Structure 1
């Protein structure tokens, strides 16, 4: 049938579009993980640096 073919073709085009977006969304999510992981490492270093800074300062005052 001609009508049939037309209707199927439209959905097949829609399907490829939907799959492309989902796969792209996936790639984006993966990039987000790399970004968040980098930020996590930065924050961890910051927390450790400040914690040591604070600990040393507290020790000094305690000596008073």
Structure 2
């Protein structure tokens, strides 16, 4: 129920067109940032896993010295 040859339509379109360009770059940008975060987290988690293991090792060792106490 509106005119597509309008000069106002023309500007509305350009407003949106500019907006879509923004939305898509942003997305492309985010999807990128996520993809990188996925790598680093994978790195980090591997690192933590080692710490936990090393910590659980030092803990057991210590736990034994206790029990091996002359009494």
* Pairwise same-fold verdict (TM > 0.5): yes
- Please give the per-residue CA displacement for 1:6-39, whole angstroms capped at 9, x wherever unaligned: 3212211210111110121111111111111211
Q: Kindly indicate which of the two structures has a greater share of residues assigned to helix.
A: 1
Count of aligned residue pairs for this structure pair: 64
Larger radius of gyration: 2
1:30 pairs with one of 35, 38, 50? 35
Higher relative contact order (CA 8 A, sep 6+): 2
Which portions of structure 1, spanning 4 or more consecutive aligned residues, are displaced by more than 2 angstroms?
1-7
- Structure 2 equivalent of residue 51 of structure 1: 56
Q: CA RMSD in A?
A: 1.4
Which TM-score applies when normalising by structure 1? 0.82
| Structure 2: runs of 5+ lacking an equivalent | 1-5
| Structure 1: runs of 5+ lacking an equivalent | none
Which TM-score applies when normalising by structure 2? 0.76
